[PDB]
Ligand binder design. Structure first.
Ligand code: CL
Ligand code: CL
Ligand code: CL
Lengths: 260, 241, 260, 247, 260, 241
């Protein structure tokens, strides 16, 4: 059973109007434009005992993603594919499950990680990639941060030597079979305005948000609307235009952090 | 191995054209002991929804001072698919429950009923893709059947991409083998999108085309919902948008 | 831990007396005699993707039962037997578990379904019959409706071709090894009266009810008392007389729906 | 299949007698003691043959989360549970569907006896543990509970006494073995408030003719009445032993 | 998530002072010295269908422990060892888990039970010793009672004949490979006093307690501090002196019950 | 096949002397949306702790009339060890959560905040033994960072026995293969022991020796905690007690 969150921090009409008044002059509380992303930090290899990891700061939102690889027999249905298992934890569920699945879908459906290249022995043994994503600081737009952390952690992942049966964890053999990074861009509808990368206050006053996932060739690769409110046909049309032109900038920035 | 999704005559595996809806069947007030109820059928996807009307909420701390709390369950019966589903809720069922609840929250005038809960229970009786939308619409109509005030009814279709071809209202076959699946639900009179998801892959152009197609589909479904509201029972044979 | 339900709808003394006053003239609210069943509908093959299914309307009680067959290795504890697994869901637990077990017991102990005839390859592979029973509308006397739905769904079940390892689901080979139908008849004690097939109001005012399960030869094949109250020796004696003579009518009616 | 002989053991043997040497109309030995637990409001150990249960009552008390209480009545909370070492093969301590059903059935039996209206907004907790199982556990547990409630001084309509009656080799028998439970045609646990002739718990698994059902029922009453007198005696002296004998 | 128990039995300052006033004269409520154990009963073979069992009465605390032996494949890491699995239930969790683990640790780390002698066919089959500890009556100092019950139950355990695959449960072959008993002694800090084997009232007014586990040659083999309060360096120093000199007496007494 | 724990030059597997602490790193106020936060590192064991300050408690019956309720979570991230930990809480995590909570309850002046809850969330980011203590200290400091009044800060180390040699602040290697592991935590200014556990095996004499060593270790850590309180960031290279 899913139910309207009773803990939800109701934000007075007076404060919403302040924010909306700024939007009307094309500016936000923290000074950025309506289409601007917050400052982005990525620290790779943050969790030393992870196979690959990334600590992402997007504004005040902090996410730590880490990978862990294991050898498993493949699923009966898919004898020639490895596995990706995404898990999200909110520390400060349901929203956690949604986040996990949305991230998973955009990694899987985009073919960013090629699962068919995770086979060791077809039908006998394949790699399972455990991706665990920990939201440490909730500063708004957790999803985009999760995607950034996830992608970064995957790129940071070391693959080890296979003794044939056994994993030799002090001989690094290679990297994950990654085709390209992927970004998720969230656009929030607040009043009659569209805003990129909504912060905490912005998320609390928004009608709804919509998240678009892009590969570098700017193909759409996942969409998820979110929030208790609705959004018009034109809103969504504009939102993706805005999202896509933002995607280019964010991909560049992501690549810089990853060493391309 | 993988089926041809568009045949040489330009038609789909079930004989439909890219712009054709599956058959629709809707009936209301089907459950006696519920405050509102509807059965919705799109082709072979069939859902029943029950509403247990605005009512004081069990543990008060879980209620809200300004609004009703919606409690929504999206669930698939074990015998709704070819292989038996575990009745225990899946991560998919958990996500979809949330997505559906949020869709309803944008429509239902919850402010009218402070300190109450409105329970919406949804059961998929047969699945042939588009279950989340059929469930959502059944819910929308059950709420209407209960006389709970809303901004508008909700109508939805999944639009998608089959063999490079943009298509309306997917099969299980098309869901399973197509390039994209994009469920969209609206309050049509308001042009307000209530649920919007895409899995798979599309170009922005394709996304825009598919979106336009979904609207045409949605408008046909919406007229049927309106009629179902008056007559309590509606049947509609497959046809072009 | 099992505890007195805090949600139950307490029904005012004044309303109970109305009902009891009617009982004293040998009639009920809906007009039926104390020994009458409510109107019965059965729609077979309601759930198309079930192997067999039945939608039962008993008064305002609605139950949908559906079967699903799978091939399993037989259980270590039960080496040469197919399996029956009964599951009940109340939608509008504990009562769900009781219902499942009571229904299961009456199908299993009566040998209505012959599990020994569900063997494919002894010790290697047998049929598991998943019976899932969904109470969609709670209008009183859910148990009797569940038994009717269950029996009907079982009779409606198609068995498929076995490729030897694989099930071929578009060649129907036969039916379930069913010996006979079974019925459960519930008799409620209200005040000093015994009433067959209690409706919603009746169940809320009753002291207790007792359910008798019968095979067509009228052998007793399960008994379950139920409710917060007690029942006298003579009450139970009379209840079974009444139940058994009702069973004959209900069996006839069930068979008509099933095509015998 | 001339040499082939049915696996099932005979349940009625030389003379009218059963696998443990009892006649069809003989109860197993009974042992009852009360007030055995210091930190509980009431307690009892009940033994029927090798079936042994302990019950503890934590007396009428304000209920933790108030929305779960009742304005007119006490809420009974009952646990029927089998210790992992109560049977020959280890039971998983996690509650089984069987334990869930029997908890409900036992709770309802107690609800017909306990004067819950006396204690609004309170809970009465009844915890039951089967220490050894040899059939009839649900009844031994129920009786242990009834007596623990009496030991706590919680007002009731009457005590509860019970036996499983059944059918062995066409023969109707009183108070079943595990062997008789396992291989018999029928098993019918019955519990009453004997002074009132009120049936508190009534179940049948297996199969019986209406005549057999009526015979078995009569036999159960005779058994119950003997158990009842022992319960009464256990109430006064706190400790009661009873060697096997004919009803 | 672990949280401060809201159900606690608060105990009025006035009652605490009574008890402390007695401590100051070197005596307790029940008349024993600050270093005295309560009266101890042990009844062996209490649970007849257990492989071994013990009913321990320590004051008003009652614990019933029972063992159950099974044949399992060993875990790959330890192919030359059997298993011990300890479980504790409080009937009148978290405290149950702590108790189990503390008991387990003191049995395991002391090598009181030699797991390497529980091997039947190396690599293929070993004994699993299921130890199930039921606290029936909560009268204070449950841990010490649990250790006593556990050790007693283990010493009471009968090992059966192995048919080679099958256990023959009516031929008793021997006993558990036990090196020695073990005792746990709990010392409670109340005000400025140290008290051995705290009863119910004493535990409710104590700052904290500390439990020391000893083998017969008085080696420390487990330590666990417990409670919401703290304890000084000197407190702990004294506590173990007291604990150890108590351990000698308790071991003697335990052995008497066990027939050494 | 055991590793030698004291090599024949009297030094441990990581090169430390028996009386040497691992390196320490502490920083405070690292989380924006929490009331107090700290990261604590001992060698390779690293924990983050967050405090969500005194606040009215959700369901009132679970609160206390005279005290705050502490709610504490000790948790290890799946990627904190070489082999992936299941994120589902283990019996170990359940016990340690209780043990840590109790340690904090002896320190935090809960009486000051009736009817409130103080939530302390702890995550082990890397484990190399001593996690429970690192977690506890991170918690202690996060509470200080939140400005929640306490009797004193909490400092802790695991002391133990390696090859008959009593050693300070154990490796994972030492934890696994040693004879004893004895985590000890105090409010050092008060000489009050907050947490005290021993697994393994020791003579009373060894126990007393190890105890003395732990105190010396604890006092060094404590001075660093004090410093971290002022400057918000502290680094300390390995050295002799
Ligand atoms: Cl869907
Ligand atoms: Cl039983
Ligand atoms: Cl640790």
């Amino acid at each position: 059973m899913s139910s309207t969150p009773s803990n939800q921090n109701i934000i007075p009409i007076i404060k919403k109007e302040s924010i909306v008044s700024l939007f009307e002059k094309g500016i936000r509380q923290d000074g950025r434009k309506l289409t601007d992303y917050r400052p982005l930090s990525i620290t790779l290899d943050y969790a030393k005992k992870a196979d690959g990891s990334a600590l992402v700061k997007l504004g005040t939102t902090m996410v730590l993603a880490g990978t862990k690889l294991e050898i498993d027999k493949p699923y009966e249905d898919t004898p020639n594919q490895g596995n990706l298992i995404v898990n999200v934890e909110l520390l400060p569920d349901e929203n956690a499950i949604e986040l996990a699945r949305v991230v998973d879908r955009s990694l899987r459906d985009s073919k960013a990680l090629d699962l068919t290249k995770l086979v060791i022995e077809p039908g006998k043994s394949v790699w399972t990639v455990w991706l665990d994503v920990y939201v440490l600081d909730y500063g708004g737009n957790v999803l985009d941060a999760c995607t950034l952390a996830s992608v970064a952690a995957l790129y940071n992942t070391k693959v080890y030597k296979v003794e044939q049966i056994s994993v030799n964890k002090n001989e690094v053999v290679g990297k994950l079979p990654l085709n390209y990074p992927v970004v998720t861009i969230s656009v929030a509808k607040v009043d009659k305005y569209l805003v990129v990368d909504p912060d905490l206050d912005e998320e609390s006053i928004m009608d709804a948000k919509i998240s678009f996932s892009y590969t570098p060739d700017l193909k759409i690769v996942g969409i998820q609307k979110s929030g208790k409110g609705s959004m018009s046909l034109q809103d969504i049309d504009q939102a993706e235009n805005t999202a896509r032109s933002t995607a280019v900038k964010l991909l560049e920035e992501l690549k810089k952090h990853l060493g391309i | 191995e993988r089926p041809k999704l568009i045949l040489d005559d330009g038609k789909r595996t079930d004989g439909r054209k890219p712009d054709e809806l599956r058959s629709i069947k809707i009936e209301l007030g089907v459950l006696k002991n519920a405050d509102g109820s509807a059965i919705f059928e799109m082709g072979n996807t069939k859902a029943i929804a029950a509403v247990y009307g605005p009512k004081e909420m069990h543990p008060r701390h879980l209620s809200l001072p300004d609004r009703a709390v919606l409690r929504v369950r999206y669930h698939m019966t074990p015998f709704s698919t070819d292989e038996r589903k575990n009745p225990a809720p899946s991560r998919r069922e958990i996500e979809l429950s949330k997505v559906i609840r949020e869709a309803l929250e944008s429509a239902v005038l919850v402010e009218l009923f402070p300190r109450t809960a409105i329970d919406v229970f949804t059961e998929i009786l047969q699945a042939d893709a588009g279950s989340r939308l059929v469930s959502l619409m059944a819910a929308s109509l059950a709420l209407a059947d209960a006389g709970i005030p809303m901004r508008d009814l909700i109508a939805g279709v999944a639009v998608g991409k089959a063999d490079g071809v943009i298509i309306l209202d997917l099969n299980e076959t098309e869901d399973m083998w197509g390039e994209a699946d994009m469920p969209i639900a609206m309050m049509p009179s308001l042009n307000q999108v209530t649920l919007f998801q895409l899995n798979g892959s599309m170009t922005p152009d394709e996304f825009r085309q598919a979106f336009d197609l979904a609207v045409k589909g949605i408008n046909i479904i919406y007229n049927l919902e309106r009629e179902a509201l008056k007559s309590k029972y509606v049947e509609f044979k497959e046809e072009g948008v």
